[PDB]
Design an enzyme around this catalytic site. Structure first.
Site, PDB file in Angstrom:
ATOM      1  N   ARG A   1       0.852  -1.181   0.000  1.00  0.00           N
ATOM      2  CA  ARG A   1       0.000   0.000   0.000  1.00  0.00           C
ATOM      3  C   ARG A   1       0.889   1.232   0.000  1.00  0.00           C
ATOM      4  NH1 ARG A   1      -4.521   2.720   2.638  1.00  0.00           N
ATOM      5  NH2 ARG A   1      -3.832   4.144   0.958  1.00  0.00           N
TER       6      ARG A   1
ATOM      7  N   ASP B   1      -1.987   0.280   9.332  1.00  0.00           N
ATOM      8  CA  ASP B   1      -0.916   1.093   8.766  1.00  0.00           C
ATOM      9  C   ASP B   1       0.522   0.979   9.237  1.00  0.00           C
ATOM     10  OD1 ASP B   1      -2.363   2.623   6.805  1.00  0.00           O
ATOM     11  OD2 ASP B   1      -3.370   3.504   8.562  1.00  0.00           O
ATOM     12  N   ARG B   2       0.726   0.865  10.541  1.00  0.00           N
ATOM     13  CA  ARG B   2       2.073   0.883  11.074  1.00  0.00           C
ATOM     14  C   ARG B   2       2.405  -0.334  11.897  1.00  0.00           C
ATOM     15  NH1 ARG B   2      -0.785   5.548  11.897  1.00  0.00           N
ATOM     16  NH2 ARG B   2      -1.349   4.643  13.917  1.00  0.00           N
TER      17      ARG B   2
ATOM     18  N   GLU C   1      -0.588  17.187   4.827  1.00  0.00           N
ATOM     19  CA  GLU C   1      -0.310  15.783   4.948  1.00  0.00           C
ATOM     20  C   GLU C   1       0.036  15.319   3.550  1.00  0.00           C
ATOM     21  OE1 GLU C   1      -0.371  14.027   7.709  1.00  0.00           O
ATOM     22  OE2 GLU C   1      -1.868  14.876   9.073  1.00  0.00           O
ATOM     23  N   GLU C   2       0.870  14.276   3.481  1.00  0.00           N
ATOM     24  CA  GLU C   2       1.233  13.588   2.229  1.00  0.00           C
ATOM     25  C   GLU C   2       1.347  14.419   0.969  1.00  0.00           C
ATOM     26  OE1 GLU C   2      -2.103  11.024   2.566  1.00  0.00           O
ATOM     27  OE2 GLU C   2      -1.059   9.640   3.879  1.00  0.00           O
TER      28      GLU C   2
ATOM     29  N   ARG D   1      -2.488  17.344   1.304  1.00  0.00           N
ATOM     30  CA  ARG D   1      -3.798  16.978   1.778  1.00  0.00           C
ATOM     31  C   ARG D   1      -4.062  17.587   3.146  1.00  0.00           C
ATOM     32  NH1 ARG D   1      -4.724  10.664   3.480  1.00  0.00           N
ATOM     33  NH2 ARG D   1      -6.205  10.929   5.202  1.00  0.00           N
ATOM     34  N   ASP D   2      -5.177  18.323   3.273  1.00  0.00           N
ATOM     35  CA  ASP D   2      -5.602  18.908   4.545  1.00  0.00           C
ATOM     36  C   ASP D   2      -6.580  17.876   5.136  1.00  0.00           C
ATOM     37  OD1 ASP D   2      -7.136  20.159   6.573  1.00  0.00           O
ATOM     38  OD2 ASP D   2      -6.997  22.101   5.597  1.00  0.00           O
TER      39      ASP D   2
ATOM     40  N   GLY E   1     -10.290  21.027   5.006  1.00  0.00           N
ATOM     41  CA  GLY E   1     -10.367  21.365   3.592  1.00  0.00           C
ATOM     42  C   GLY E   1     -10.724  20.287   2.581  1.00  0.00           C
TER      43      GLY E   1
ATOM     44  N   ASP F   1     -10.341  16.671  -3.006  1.00  0.00           N
ATOM     45  CA  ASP F   1     -10.052  15.752  -1.912  1.00  0.00           C
ATOM     46  C   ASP F   1     -11.166  14.705  -1.898  1.00  0.00           C
ATOM     47  OD1 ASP F   1      -8.762  14.562   0.222  1.00  0.00           O
ATOM     48  OD2 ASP F   1      -8.407  16.422   1.243  1.00  0.00           O
TER      49      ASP F   1
ATOM     50  N   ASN G   1     -10.715  13.700   7.326  1.00  0.00           N
ATOM     51  CA  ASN G   1     -10.534  12.651   6.352  1.00  0.00           C
ATOM     52  C   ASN G   1      -9.954  13.231   5.071  1.00  0.00           C
ATOM     53  OD1 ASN G   1     -10.592   9.935   5.877  1.00  0.00           O
ATOM     54  ND2 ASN G   1     -12.817   9.809   5.529  1.00  0.00           N
TER      55      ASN G   1
ATOM     56  N   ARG H   1     -13.233   6.255  -2.144  1.00  0.00           N
ATOM     57  CA  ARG H   1     -12.063   6.196  -3.015  1.00  0.00           C
ATOM     58  C   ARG H   1     -12.421   5.289  -4.174  1.00  0.00           C
ATOM     59  NH1 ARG H   1      -7.501   5.289   1.734  1.00  0.00           N
ATOM     60  NH2 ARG H   1      -7.663   7.455   2.504  1.00  0.00           N
TER      61      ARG H   1
ATOM     62  N   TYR I   1      -4.690   6.291  -3.190  1.00  0.00           N
ATOM     63  CA  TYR I   1      -3.682   7.329  -3.286  1.00  0.00           C
ATOM     64  C   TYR I   1      -3.261   7.606  -4.732  1.00  0.00           C
ATOM     65  CZ  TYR I   1      -3.080   7.720   1.758  1.00  0.00           C
ATOM     66  OH  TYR I   1      -3.254   8.077   3.073  1.00  0.00           O
TER      67      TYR I   1
END
Ligand SMILES: *[C@@H]1O[C@H](CO)[C@@H](O[C@@H]2O[C@H](CO)[C@@H](O[C@@H]3O[C@H](CO)[C@@H](O)[C@H](O[C@H]4O[C@H](CO)[C@@H](O)[C@H](O)[C@@H]4O[C@H]4O[C@H](CO)[C@@H](O)[C@H](O)[C@@H]4O[C@H]4O[C@H](CO)[C@@H](O)[C@H](O)[C@@H]4O)[C@@H]3O)[C@H](O)[C@H]2NC(C)=O)[C@H](O)[C@H]1NC(C)=O
Ligand SMILES: *[C@@H]1O[C@H](CO)[C@@H](O[C@@H]2O[C@H](CO)[C@@H](O[C@@H]3O[C@H](CO)[C@@H](O)[C@H](O[C@H]4O[C@H](CO)[C@@H](O)[C@H](O)[C@@H]4O[C@H]4O[C@H](CO)[C@@H](O)[C@H](O)[C@@H]4O[C@H]4O[C@H](CO)[C@@H](O)[C@H](O)[C@@H]4O)[C@@H]3O)[C@H](O)[C@H]2NC(C)=O)[C@H](O)[C@H]1NC(C)=O
Ligand SMILES: *[C@@H]1O[C@H](CO)[C@@H](O[C@@H]2O[C@H](CO)[C@@H](O[C@@H]3O[C@H](CO)[C@@H](O)[C@H](O[C@H]4O[C@H](CO)[C@@H](O)[C@H](O)[C@@H]4O[C@H]4O[C@H](CO)[C@@H](O)[C@H](O)[C@@H]4O[C@H]4O[C@H](CO)[C@@H](O)[C@H](O)[C@@H]4O)[C@@H]3O)[C@H](O)[C@H]2NC(C)=O)[C@H](O)[C@H]1NC(C)=O
Ligand SMILES: *[C@@H]1O[C@H](CO)[C@@H](O[C@@H]2O[C@H](CO)[C@@H](O[C@@H]3O[C@H](CO)[C@@H](O)[C@H](O[C@H]4O[C@H](CO)[C@@H](O)[C@H](O)[C@@H]4O[C@H]4O[C@H](CO)[C@@H](O)[C@H](O)[C@@H]4O[C@H]4O[C@H](CO)[C@@H](O)[C@H](O)[C@@H]4O)[C@@H]3O)[C@H](O)[C@H]2NC(C)=O)[C@H](O)[C@H]1NC(C)=O
Ligand SMILES: CCCN(C)C(=O)[C@@H]1OC(C(=O)O)=C[C@H](NC(=N)N)[C@H]1NC(C)=O
Ligand SMILES: CCCN(C)C(=O)[C@@H]1OC(C(=O)O)=C[C@H](NC(=N)N)[C@H]1NC(C)=O
Ligand SMILES: CCCN(C)C(=O)[C@@H]1OC(C(=O)O)=C[C@H](NC(=N)N)[C@H]1NC(C)=O
Ligand SMILES: CCCN(C)C(=O)[C@@H]1OC(C(=O)O)=C[C@H](NC(=N)N)[C@H]1NC(C)=O
Ligand SMILES: *[C@@H]1O[C@H](CO)[C@@H](O)[C@H](O)[C@H]1NC(C)=O
Ligand SMILES: *[C@@H]1O[C@H](CO)[C@@H](O)[C@H](O)[C@H]1NC(C)=O
Ligand SMILES: *[C@@H]1O[C@H](CO)[C@@H](O)[C@H](O)[C@H]1NC(C)=O
Ligand SMILES: *[C@@H]1O[C@H](CO)[C@@H](O)[C@H](O)[C@H]1NC(C)=O
Ligand SMILES: *[C@@H]1O[C@H](CO)[C@@H](O)[C@H](O)[C@H]1NC(C)=O
Ligand SMILES: *[C@@H]1O[C@H](CO)[C@@H](O)[C@H](O)[C@H]1NC(C)=O
Ligand SMILES: *[C@@H]1O[C@H](CO)[C@@H](O)[C@H](O)[C@H]1NC(C)=O
Ligand SMILES: [Ca+2]
Ligand SMILES: [Ca+2]
Ligand SMILES: [Ca+2]
Ligand SMILES: [Ca+2]
Lengths: 388, 388, 388, 388
Positions: free
Chosen positions: A37, A70-71, A196-197, A212-213, A217, A244, A266, A290, A324
């Protein structure tokens, strides 16, 4: 040989042609393919490669169960040949971590991986395949970065990190690295409320990142960076064509310096090529999930708060999953201008397809053409029922 | 180093010796082998490789179901080492598409892949592994190309495309590329009524392509190209030894400038080496299906409308399947002359073997010898019952 | 760089140390390993590699059934890295055929594969990975060659072929190749009555091959070749320590120019290092089957018809299977002398182990040491019951 | 280019950052991963690689049964790319043996493998991938070596072997090799009573090895070697922070020249960086088994018999398995000082996890940082229940 310098400008983008596609999940149904991912594409002066964060297991393997998380200590940044799937045998690990970025400066590649507990994460910068610099968390809340390639100019490669809350004001910094060493770092400036990202690209000695907010936003923040003066500024894309996801429906007028309200806490990593009338935005088709993906030419989107699409190209149909998406370009290709490119992560598995216990993706990437090429859709192509 | 020039002529062909065979389907029964079709062979100055259009799945994989279909978003042009099978781990993707061609000009390789909907397909030309030029469909009906290697001479590599109807007059063009750029393009000329999938080779600064008339000819059209003057002409092979498939039985006299009538709207890609008395034609043994394969020396086949075989060599027995066949040569081999070579696609699965749900192939390739070598047959070798 | 010349002599051989072992059948029980037989080892100036004739299927694959058969269209000469197993993914095909030999001359490698029907086989010589010369069968009865590496001296690499009957007088020739071309060929001379599968090595500008008399000899024929004068001679090893298999029990006196009678129409490829008192012979332990393997120092074995062992080293125990064995040496290793080496094929499956339907092998290879190293046995190591 | 010289000193070690992790057992559950043990890491001037002794079988393979056993003819020293798992397809065999060491001298790599019966084992030294020197057992009781990388200085690479009893006085020697040849060898000197599996590193032209006293010491012996004068000396780490395993609980005062009594006839290979106040020791957390792993800064541990920890970092939690651990450093990394690194073998399977019949491991490795990075634990990550 020598450090690359961003001396060209973008080529005219009249359409998008297919560049690479790995069909990872179709093939992984019966091959030793790694679960991944957060993929991206990045070029070296002599080869362009696919990158992504592995989950440390194959799709068909038993450990594929749970890869929505994710982590963990089992992820690593891996690269592999363009259009091949990320297999256990042809993948090269760049570094260990659950967040990353990577770029070639002309002489060699810098890779940055972040790992750790949510409250004690650290970034370790690799240059020429050796660890060089390390940065410990400053806000104690998931130190994270771009998830797509950085860009360099004369040895200097700015990178945007964010540390702190995902849904409030957080602490975002722009580091300027040269040969794996830190030359300087700045706090975020300008009007962007959350970052972000970031997805970045470079042309005519300036670097542009569409980020990315995640807070409030639905329009995307932009960070323009000057790699020579090592300064930057930030704002939001003015256009009413919101990019977004999840997001409200497009209004008739957008905002240039404040988040467009609608959906909170988000988002999705995305990108845009901002070049006057030669401006194209990428967005999921669905405002709710998405799903689907399209490119829209919206002249002067960055500054024109009433700018609407003048042309378009569907990449993934709204019945197919996306995820993404980010920018990259082959800064070492022959030519008078830089050919804009981008990739789209095609997520399969959880959360949407709950019939399986894993979450993975394949990749589709395109580059611009000055021609007005016919379009086609490029879905992942795997049939989930074969995995049950 | 420098652009290759076609300075030699063909060697005398007294027989054919085994060059390469991958045994792909035997091996793929228990290895991660990709499903393919439309294969070919092509040399670089330092290595000769196998090429084919992948279906984006392994033979044993579940997605192998349905691979009889020609065009989808999951196909890509892949290359791999000579005589190895096309596996998921040793295959390099050249480009994304369902039709292709590729050739090395001496300095680097050009690959062209075509993808898209039947009515909005586009070719994207790659040179030195980067996209360079793109061509959108001109007739809106499946823009397609050779399916075997192109040939270059002093930087110029002509390529034959056809766009439009498979069973009527269509629009065929000959592009002349140099370093991925278009130097010029011509409409097809001469007497050939329909052109599809040209198999080309080059000698003494002239390029010869034996193509396929899918409309009405059972004799094959030939396109002779002059890469220096960038012009061409077309006709049909005069000989009564018909080489298309399906086809009528051989008559006693053939036609030089008109299709020999008999079977309509069908054919198979094939090739021929046309060199005066040193002329050899390849054809399926069966006039009804893609079965068996043989080479026949038919002196002056191109011009002599009563020419019959003077020698022969069986490649695949009529009890075994065959399929596409095309020419290639190692233009960089040491020697006084160019050694003629060819490959034969050995299709397994659908439509003929309906017991399985997939369609794939293996490859057998031979090169000429000036000796009069003994012959052997070279079938695919897989036992379909092992796949049920 | 330049052609290699055999300027050194053998090092003193006081014992044998382990060089390489691939454990192919243990590993192949659960990996994509190719079924092989007739293996050997051969060095290039910068790497030494394992070689063997593939059967065109994996051990676990369904097509592994029947691989006891020697000649088919699915075999090919493959090479792979030293001590790795011959897998589908790391194996390089050298040429297509069911009999072969290969050697590096200092500048590049020559590989020769023979394929075809029993009565119309042909050898095709490859040099620098391109076909160069072809030789058609002269006796119409299974044209065959060494099955282990050839040796070169100043560009000239003699190779021994045999064509005709396996159990009578046959026609054996010694070709002298230089850059893939034939410089000359001789009929076999001297007292050897039958020649098959010669195992050769070179020292001080002379080439020695220990072959196999499949007709009537239990003692091995030797062919000494002079690569400069391009001449040769043949005899038999004089010693009573018989090294073929199956064979009679050792007598007290042997024969120098006639086969030692006992067993007829059978044998095994083997080798020997013949160097005065520094002479070592290799043989199966069992006189009845290809089982066990040992090395014995028998001073002056070649000429002394009463020579008996003065030292020994067990390689494979008589309870474990063995098979073909041959010589090779790294002619490019640093040093004052050439270090003698050899490999032993460890056959598993049919005919002896009838519980499985396949026949394959693994390899064990050793090189000499001037020390008197302790010994260990090196069996294949696979447990056949895991394959049922 | 030229022989490497140890001209720098260690960098300040304020914390440890993640360097490499292969997740071998997670991935091997569904990929062709080799069963291994006794791993280590070692760098060449241009790449750092993972090393280990293969068991000659995959984890999922049937031959994985029994891999708890240490010495057999099926083990071999293999290397593979950093952070990749040791797979059948990407692993390079360095030599055949059940004990080993390896180091690059700047010009090329030397690898040493030992194989044989317990009473007739022998070491064979490889240099530049060719066997060069061989050493036969001197005490007839399992000739063995380091199990982690050696270190060189100006062409000379000392290596520590031990031959004889595992639980008594044994015969330990320090060989000094240059280009695979023996320059000299010494009997062990100083106060260390027993030496096994030394973990070495080099700085400022001195070589330090922290070994294992399997007989009676719970504190670790140290061997300091002078590669120029080719001499050495030995003692024990003075600190009360005991680092062997199994071991007694830490006392308040330790011993500098005698084993600290407590546990007998057992231990684990480990390491330490001994640099005045910049001294860090590694140890299992558990005093009873190979479980957990931590690093502790114990200033002047080597000489201060009352030295206690001043800082620490947990690597593996005490609920997770650990195993062998050793040092390595990239002597060819850019920089003013040498960055200390180490690896930890994470054993899974027998003896502790008896639910499976195999024994294997994965690897976690870290390097120092001058920063005070946050910590995280790095367990193997495989779920044994998936293997039942
Ligand atoms: C061969 O290939 C050629 C080349 O590709 C084909 O021609 C191309 O055809 C494309 C498809 O028509 C065409 O793209 C379109 O271009 C127009 C501008 O001319 C553009 O406005 C289109 O985009 C709108 O519509 C699509 C859906 O059709 C939406 O998904 C898209 O988001 C745009 O509309 C949305 O946003 C607008 C601006 O805010 C709104 O005004 C509109 O209402 C709509 O909003 C709703 O949907 C949003 C998205 O879900 C949502 O967020 C929002 O809240 C609202 O709900 C589209 O890009 C190319 O320009 C054209 N190119 C060329 C060179 O000709 C041709 O078809 C092919 N040949 C054949 C035989 O098929
Ligand atoms: C060791 O190796 C050597 C070297 O290979 C062997 O010698 C070779 O043996 C070959 C086999 O005989 C031989 O090939 C033949 O050569 C003759 C010319 O001399 C050639 O005419 C033969 O081709 C015809 O026949 C085959 C079938 O046998 C057909 O498949 C082929 O198509 C040719 O006939 C068809 O077309 C002709 C022309 O139109 C018609 O006249 C004929 O009727 C036939 O037509 C029907 O079949 C067509 C195909 O299906 C169909 O489309 C049509 O409608 C009709 O129905 C063949 O090439 C080599 O010349 C010879 N070479 C040398 C150097 O000697 C030797 O056997 C081996 N040694 C041993 C012990 O076996
Ligand atoms: C540590 O390592 C060292 C170094 O390896 C070990 O020392 C070595 O030990 C070896 C084993 O003893 C030793 O080899 C022997 O050397 C003698 C000469 O000294 C040699 O004659 C031996 O070979 C004969 O015996 C073996 C069986 O033991 C046979 O398999 C072999 O074929 C030889 O005998 C056969 O042929 C002879 C000649 O014709 C006949 O006289 C004899 O009867 C026999 O014939 C029958 O068997 C044949 C084979 O099946 C058959 O064809 C025939 O028809 C008859 O039926 C053997 O090579 C090394 O010399 C020695 N090396 C050194 C440097 O010391 C030591 O053990 C290890 N340490 C420990 C603790 O174990
Ligand atoms: C973000 O990251 C930072 C940086 O990592 C975190 O800060 C670090 O936190 C570490 C954990 O506290 C800290 O390590 C500790 O440092 C102290 C010295 O200040 C050190 O003494 C600690 O080590 C002892 O304790 C651990 C268990 O907690 C033991 O496993 C260890 O063996 C040491 O104690 C044992 O040996 C001692 C000496 O003999 C004895 O005095 C003691 O009783 C104990 O003995 C028993 O256990 C032994 C082991 O089993 C056994 O053999 C013996 O027989 C006895 O039974 C530990 O290393 C770092 O110094 C600190 N670093 C920095 C820069 O701050 C921070 O937590 C993270 N942030 C967040 C929010 O979590
Ligand atoms: C941390 C808050 C905002 N943020 C950027 C996210 O949560 C991202 O979410 C997503 C996501 O798919 O939306 C995946 C990213 N996963 C990942 N990179 N492993 C993750 N980032 C991190 C660091 O975990
Ligand atoms: C389009 C009409 C004529 N034509 C050349 C064909 O239909 C060819 O048929 C066959 C065939 O096996 O006969 C496969 C080719 N498949 C393929 N290249 N994927 C296909 N070409 C295209 C472009 O789809
Ligand atoms: C032909 C008569 C004598 N001879 C040399 C043999 O029969 C050899 O037998 C054996 C054998 O194991 O004994 C295998 C060889 N198999 C092989 N190379 N594929 C085969 N040679 C050929 C050419 O088939
Ligand atoms: C021989 C006595 C002391 N010693 C060093 C050991 O027994 C080691 O034990 C262990 C162990 O895990 O404790 C594995 C080693 N296994 C191995 N290297 N294959 C082994 N060494 C040898 C040579 O077998
Ligand atoms: C980039 O510019 C710097 C000077 O500003 C120059 O030294 C370097 O060589 C340039 N890079 C290239 C690739 O020309
Ligand atoms: C091909 O010919 C051109 C000139 O016509 C020449 O410049 C080039 O070097 C030639 N190619 C080779 C390989 O000699
Ligand atoms: C393949 O697909 C068809 C149609 O999609 C289906 O009916 C058939 O059963 C499938 N074959 C197999 C073996 O699953
Ligand atoms: C082998 O000898 C020839 C001359 O007899 C010489 O030209 C060649 O360079 C020699 N080979 C080497 C490797 O020196
Ligand atoms: C192998 O082949 C034979 C003959 O072709 C057949 O009888 C036998 O059952 C096969 N063995 C297996 C395991 O299928
Ligand atoms: C190491 O030192 C020796 C001389 O003591 C020198 O010749 C060699 O070049 C040095 N190594 C390097 C890498 O400079
Ligand atoms: C492994 O081996 C033992 C002894 O060789 C046997 O009892 C056991 O059942 C085997 N385990 C498995 C899973 O086969
Ligand atoms: Ca948002
Ligand atoms: Ca036709
Ligand atoms: Ca015999
Ligand atoms: Ca101990």
């Amino acid at each position: 040989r020598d450090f690359n310098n961003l001396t060209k400008g973008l080529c005219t983008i009249n359409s998008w042609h297919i560049y690479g596609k790995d069909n990872a999940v179709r093939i992984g149904e019966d091959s030793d393919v790694l679960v991944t991912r957060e993929p991206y594409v990045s070029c070296d002066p002599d080869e362009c490669r696919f990158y992504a964060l592995s989950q440390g297991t194959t799709i068909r393997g038993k450990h594929s169960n749970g890869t929505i998380h994710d982590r963990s200590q089992y992820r690593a940044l891996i690269s592999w040949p363009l259009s091949s799937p990320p297999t256990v045998y042809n993948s090269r690990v760049e570094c260990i971590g659950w967040s990353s970025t990577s770029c070639h400066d002309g002489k060699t590649r810098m890779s940055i991986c972040i790992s750790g507990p949510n409250n004690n994460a650290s970034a370790v910068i690799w240059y020429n395949r050796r660890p060089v610099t390390e940065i410990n968390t400053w806000a104690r809340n998931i130190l994270r970065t771009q998830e797509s390639e950085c860009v360099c100019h004369n040895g200097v490669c700015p990178v945007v990190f964010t540390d702190g809350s995902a849904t409030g004001p957080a602490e975002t910094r722009i580091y300027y690295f040269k040969e794996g060493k830190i030359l300087k770092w700045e706090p975020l400036a300008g009007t962007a409320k959350h970052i972000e990202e970031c997805s970045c690209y470079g042309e005519r000695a300036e670097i542009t990142c569409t980020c990315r907010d995640n807070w409030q936003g639905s329009n995307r923040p932009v960070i323009r960076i000057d790699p020579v003066a090592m300064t930057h500024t930030s704002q939001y894309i003015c256009s009413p064509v919101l990019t977004d996801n999840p997001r409200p429906n497009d209004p008739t007028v957008g905002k240039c310096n404040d988040p467009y309200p609608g959906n909170n806490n988000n988002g999705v990593k995305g990108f845009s090529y901002l070049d006057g009338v030669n401006t194209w935005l990428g967005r999921t088709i669905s405002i709710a999930s998405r799903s689907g993906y399209e490119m829209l030419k919206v002249p002067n989107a960055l500054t024109d708060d009433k700018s609407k699409p003048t042309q378009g190209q569907t990449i993934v149909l709204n019945t197919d999953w996306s995820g993404y998406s980010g920018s990259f370009m082959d800064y070492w290709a022959e030519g008078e201008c830089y050919r804009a490119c981008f990739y789209v992560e095609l997520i399969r598995g959880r959360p949407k397809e709950d019939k399986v216990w894993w979450t993975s993706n394949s990749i589709v990437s395109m580059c611009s053409s000055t021609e007005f090429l016919g379009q086609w859709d490029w879905p992942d192509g795997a049939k989930i029922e074969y995995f049950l």
